[PDB]
Each structure stands twice: as C-alpha cells, then as structure tokens.
Amino acid sequence: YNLQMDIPHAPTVVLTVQDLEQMEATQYTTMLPWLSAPATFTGVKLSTLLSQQYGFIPNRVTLRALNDYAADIDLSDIEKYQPIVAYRQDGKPMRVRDKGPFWLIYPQSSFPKELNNERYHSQMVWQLKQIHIA
C-alpha cells in the first residue's frame, strides 16, 4: 500500500507512508461530506511532494485510487488551496481498506463556497496509490 509516482525522464518512485512522514508536515482541520464531525488531517502538501519528486509543479496531475478511480488536479488549485496528501486523521493512521493509507484533502472549511461542492469533493482521492502527469 504505497504511492507510485510516475516521473517523465526518471524511474518511477515508490514512496511509503514513512517517506511522507519524513517530509514537512502540514495539518488542516475541516469538515467534509464523508465525516461525522470535523477532523484534523496531517499530511504533506501535494505541491511539496510533486516538486521534490518531479523537480517542478506540473500543469495537471492525475491521482488514482486502489479501485482505479482517477481524478485530475490543476496547478491553480494546488497553488490557491494547497491540498495535502494526508497520512493521519485525528492523529491516527488510516486503515488501508477504508480511506488509507493516503487521502488527498482540501481545507474545505477554510474556503467554504469555493470548495464545498462536487467539483472539489471528486478530487479528494482516498486509498491514493498513483500520481502521474495528466
């Protein structure tokens, strides 16, 4: 249950949950449609993860889940809202058969009108296992 990142002119990198824990941590507290109460997520900013593995922030990346659901994320949204690849919810790891080990989280509660809609909910890929340039 790792995170495969496809790199254009370099080998595909396989990141573990430990690899993300060793990167700069960001925490967001937010409500989301799948939660019973707001939760605090700990993760690495997608911008940080992409720059450290691609050496730049691409125009658009595709995130793919365990079940092959795929969603695209745009540079503008990465810059404006700074979503995180979460690896911890309320300080605990997320079970891999539920939404773990990785879940793309936007800080919905910090930008309610912009983010609380299906346009952004559909980008919050849980059981995240692959990233590639779109």
The residues of the shown chain that bind Na ion, judged by CB under 5 A, are 122
Q: How far apart are CA 40 and CA 88, in angstroms?
A: 8
Shorter beta-carbon distance to Na ion: residue 110 or 122: 122
Report, in Å, the least distance between residue 72 CB and Na ion: 8
Nearest approach in angstroms of CB 23 to Na ion is 27
Residues paired with residue 128 on neighbouring β-strands, in sequence order: 65
Q: Phi and psi for 51 in degrees, rounded to 5?
A: -60, -40
Residue with smaller CB distance to Na ion, 95 or 119: 119
What minimum distance in Å lies between the beta carbon of 42 and Na ion? 25
* Residues 6 and 15: beta-carbon distance below 8 Å: no
Which single residue brings its beta carbon nearest to Na ion? 122
119 token code pair: 């346009």
Please say whether the beta carbons of 102 and 87 come within 8 A: yes
Indicate the residue among 72 and 98 with the shorter CB distance to Na ion. 72
